[PDB]
Design a protein around this ligand. Structure first.
Ligand SMILES: CC(=O)N[C@H]1[C@@H](OP(=O)(O)OP(=O)(O)OC[C@H]2O[C@@H](n3ccc(=O)[nH]c3=O)[C@H](O)[C@@H]2O)O[C@H](CO)[C@@H](O)[C@@H]1O
Ligand SMILES: [Ca+2]
Length: 276
């Protein structure tokens, strides 16, 4: 009888350790395409400050195609476009028209792009960029960066579990910078929520396609990014481990918790590359 309980416990703990060991690497990191996407749409000239930040962004990332996307479907955009072409001529920053993207014809099937056309028609360029950045990432992947952020250090070769890299939370994750694989479910979900928010006439611009919506998408697709969900998971494991050892219902070691946390900490690995 005593040998039976010893067998049952060593088998149960074996299964448990294998599961903890698997959890550390459960989502193999996926390479991010080496494109940096920045947005400057509208009719106003880019500021000399942001020209300098953008060139610095390109210099600290010589292994990347760095681009600023404008939109020729915006009335009166021509001046701003010309100014940029001349200011970035002597740099490795590429100035490109969204309308000339190879995938542009496919956007006629996107309800989110119908909303984007409404937003730019009201000259709401900052609000528009919340939708535009998701569309670019959906179709191309790569890294989206804010035009006015300082590049602290080069991105390098990035790989991320579930093909998504974000900056740690402020409770919300910022919607910049974002590193993602193309056609990523997190980006598609954010756009889906955004269509819903525009349809119902959400008036808070941040709750249309902002960090709070990006956050909801992250939590739905990867629940363990939410500390409350991850905490409930750890308590479940703590209880499962004592059940395995047949001890009354703290057993989780710091090693085991490091492994459980590893993919979710790795997703937050886009922290520290861009500032201000
Ligand atoms: C902490 C926080 O809540 N920040 C939000 C805030 O940032 P914030 O208020 O800093 O937004 P910005 O004014 O920088 O504009 C966002 C982006 O819009 C683009 N732009 C802006 C003006 C323009 O004429 N042309 C143009 O292309 C630029 O790429 C710019 O980087 O509002 C943004 C737009 O809703 C959201 O993305 C941010 O998450
Ligand atoms: Ca900004």
């Amino acid at each position: 009888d005593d040998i039976r309980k010893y067998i049952a416990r060593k088998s149960a703990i074996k299964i448990f350790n294998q599961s903890i060991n698997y959890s550390a690497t459960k989502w193999p990191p996926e390479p991010i395409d080496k494109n940096i996407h920045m947005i400057w749409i509208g009719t106003k000239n880019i500021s000399e400050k942001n020209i300098k930040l953008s060139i610095d962004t390109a210099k600290k990332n010589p292994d990347y195609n760095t681009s600023i996307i404008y939109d020729s479907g915006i009335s009166g955009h021509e001046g701003a476009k010309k100014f940029m072409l001349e200011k970035f001529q002597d740099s490795n920053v590429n100035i490109i028209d969204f309308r000339k993207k190879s995938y542009f014809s496919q956007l006629k099937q996107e309800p989110s792009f119908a909303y984007y056309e409404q937003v730019i028609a009201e000259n709401k360029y900052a609000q528009a960029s919340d939708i535009l950045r998701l569309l670019v990432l959906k179709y191309e992947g790569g890294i989206y960066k804010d035009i006015d952020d300082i590049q602290v250090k080069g991105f390098g070769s990035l790989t991320f579990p579930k093909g998504i890299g974000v900056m740690r939370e402020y409770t919300a994750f910022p919607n910049t910078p974002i590193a993602v694989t193309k056609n990523n479910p997190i980006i598609n979900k954010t756009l889906d929520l955004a269509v819903s928010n525009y349809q119902r006439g959400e008036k808070n611009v941040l709750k249309l396609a902002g960090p709070d919506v990006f956050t909801q998408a992250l939590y739905q697709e990867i629940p363990g990014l939410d500390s409350k969900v991850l905490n409930a998971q750890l308590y479940q494991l703590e209880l499962a481990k004592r059940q395995a050892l047949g001890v009354p219902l703290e057993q989780l070691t710091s090693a085991e918790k490091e492994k459980i946390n590893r993919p979710y900490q790795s997703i937050r690995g886009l922290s520290g590359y861009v500032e201000n």
